[PDB]
Structure formats: structure tokens, C-alpha cells
Amino acid sequence: YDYLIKLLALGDSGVGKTTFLYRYTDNKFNPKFITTVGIDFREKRVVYDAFKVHLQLWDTAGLERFRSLTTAFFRDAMGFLLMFDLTSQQSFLNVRNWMSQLQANAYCENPDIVLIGNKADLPDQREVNERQARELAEKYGIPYFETSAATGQNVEKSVETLLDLIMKRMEKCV
Template identity: 60%
Template sequence: MAMANIDYDFLMKFLALGDSGVGKTSFLYQYTDGQFHSQFISTVGIDFREKRLIYTYRGRNHRIHLQLWDTAGQERFRSLTTAFYRDAMGFLLIFDLTNEKSFLEISNWLEQLRMHAYSEDPDVVLCGNKCDLEAVRAVSHEQVRALSDRYSLPYIETSACTGFNIRQAVEMLVERVMLRMENVATNSELSRLMTQTRCMPNINLPSSGGNTVRLGYRDMELTEEQQRSRNCKC
């Protein structure tokens, strides 16, 4: 597609990461559709959502096209999902406030990011999901504060069920990416992500509902590892 036909200022690709069952899929559906799906269906491989928004940054409105990638939390899909880390500009790292194990795994997810993301210090927003279930909360405020301070991560509590702080969490990540973009001239890897204009080949990816998500969006490239994953029969 010709550059003249692009009707947005920035394309941003975000990945939602975290253990299986923390609510990543419900989080993204709540953000894009304003709906909550109570039936749990584990994501298989990679799923995909998108949304347009007008974001005001430093007094100027920017048209942003968000590509939101929903990754499987299970270990058996890790080799597939990490192949998509390098081309993401930001990460929503989600844990379940009612499941301490999902919180304890945050350090491992951050290590995966440092190994596979575009930078050893990528833009991440830490989200404690299911805050509406306060009666069965298993992760204390003190635990979260200690971890977020340790890794210098912005933290926000969300509820995919009620929609509480979902939009705010995504916009928090947008703001961090916009801030980093101001220094894009000194960050060659982020510059690569922002200036990609080659068309992404159509690929088939299994979705959480057992259907196929067919993609054909511009401004993205597949790495060799992603190309190999096109034939995955996970």
C-alpha cells in the first residue's frame, strides 16, 4: 500500500504477556470491544486485536493504529511467541492478583523480554488484573510495590471484567513509547520498528476460539523465525 494512503501517524505493536489464565485475552477484548467474555478459552499460539485512537501528547493529537497481540501463556508455546517479541514496541505484562504463582513468574517473563525484545530495557507496563476480586486477593500491595520498584516498572491494577483501568493501562504504555520515540535518532532498533513500510505477508495463526486469524497488515515484517512458525501445527 502506498505511503500516501496511510491514514494514521504511528503504528504501534504491543504484546500482552503473562501466565495462562491471568486474563490477557479478556483484557484485550475489553479494550477493543468494551466487552467481557466470562468463558475461559486458553489462547493457542498467538491471537490478534486492533484499535485506532487519537492520543494527545505534548499538546498535539496523534492518530495511532494499535496492533495488540495476545500471546499464549503456556510454556509449550514459548518458542513461538518469543519470535514476535523483537518486532513489538511495548509490552503489557499481566498477572492475576488472585494467583500468587502468576505474580512470582513476572521475573521470568522479564528475563524473556531482555533476551528477545528490541532492547534489554523495553517499554513495559505491569498490570495486576482481576482487582475486582479483592476478597480472594493473593498478592499484597507490598509485594507488588517491591517488585515494581526493583525493576522500575510502572504498575496499574485492572479488571477485565468491569473495565476498570483497562484503557488507562494501554495509554500508559502508549505514552512511554511516545516518550522513547522522542529519542528515536539515538535508538536504531526502535527507529527500525517505526519506519518499517514493507507489507506483511498473509499468515495463518490459530486463535483462542479454534478459528484462524488471517492477517495482511502493512508496516510489519516477519523474521526468519516467524516465517518458520507459519507452518506450526501446535
């Protein structure tokens, strides 16, 4: 091959990232890198003044590892499959709220994004107005697709669009 293009699936839990990726991939190669993170507490008896206070002092573990894991996830990423759930308004707003926080880098250093409304095969459950979603896409001048990981609707179409953005970005930047 000639190129290694790194893509990321972002979005809330239960949105369909893992199912979308497996739908598109159509193979079983999926190497995993897991770590443990945790919380805990300790206790101490303490007499205030009269009063017998019971102290719980909480703490966290494994955060350093988690950061390396996060960095490793974003390292050299060229496209984000930014997805939400058409049946979940909360998934849509979280995306919009997330986007409003991104800081622009130089044109070439900016990663491409495709906005993805997943679970298009359950119209009876839809919460996300189409017009609202297209406007978010319009706002940040990005493509928008309504996809289904179960049917395969626009799954291949959305990914190849992201590739095309990435590839056309290179042509200009090289």
C-alpha cells in the same frame, strides 16, 4: 494514520490476557494464525541379557513452525502488557522470575513494559500483596496498575501509559 505501535500481552494462562484485550479493543477484528504441534512415541521389543524390556521412544513435531510463530510474536514489539492475577500468587512469582532473566539491550532497543495486576474486582480472592507488586515495579522502574477486564478498571489507563512510554522513548531516540 501516522504510526503502527505493536503491543504484546504476556502472562500465565487464565490471567486474563484475552479478556483484557477484548475489553480494551471494543471491536471484533482479530485475525488468527494457528499451527499444530505434537508429541509421539514408538516401540520395540528388546531382550536384555533374561529380561524382556519394552521400549518407548518419544518424539516431537512442529517445533520449527512454533519458533517462527514465536519470532513473529516478538518481532518489532515496543511494549509488553505484563500481567498477573491478583488472586493468584503463582502468577505473580512467575512474572518476577521471568523479569529477573531479561537481558538489557540499548535504551532505544529496550521495549517498554507496564506491570498489570488483573482481576481487581475480586478482593475476597486476592493473594498478591500490593506492596510486593509495587516493589517489583519500583525495582525495574516501571508503572504498575491494578486492573479489571470485567469492570474495565484501569484497562484504558494502563494501555495508554504504555503507549506514552513508547512515544516518549521515540522522541529521545529518533
